[PDB]
């Protein structure tokens with residue numbers, strides 16, 4: 001499950017493009033997640049009333065949430081697998097307060113990949129997409145192990 005340095009640089013080089021406008025990327029990723037897997041929207045008490053993509057795009061609070069979420073993910077990715085400290089708080093909140101199954105982490109990973117594939121073909125060819133998938137699989141593996149330590153089946 002361990003990534004090479006080369007693989008991490010493919011991850012970080014596409015992430016550098018996300019960081020030109022993290023808010024806009026976050027909006028596109030949430031819209032993709034909620035349209036592909038509508039059940040995931042039901043986990044968001046503050047956003048579950050949004051009915052359409054237009055409402056999602058107009059939500060300033062959802063935009064701010066996407067910035068928080070992608071910035072936390074980016075800090076994980078920049079650790080290049082040495083992310084134990086970052087995963088502790090995230091696993092605890094997601095297991096115990098939000099109750100987010102591993103299957104829903106797989107869905108958001110799919111939405112991230114889809115949006116990078118569409119926006120960033122210059123830095124998201126097949127090898128770069130493979131490296132990003134490996135990094136998100138590692139994240140999900142390590143979160144699942146923490147979930148189990150915390151008492152949550154995931």
Ligand code: HEM
Nearest residue numbers: 040043044045046068069072073090093098100104105108
């Ligand atoms: C890449 C994966 C994800 C990352 C990095 C991430 C990160 C975060 C962060 C940093 C927060 C705020 C602090 C906290 O409560 O822990 C948060 C809140 C939250 N997350 Fe996630 N998250 C991820 C995936 C998901 C998914 C897939 C769902 C639901 C389907 C979800 C549901 C929530 C909810 C319900 C909150 C509270 C939102 C609010 O305050 O209105 N998360 N997430």
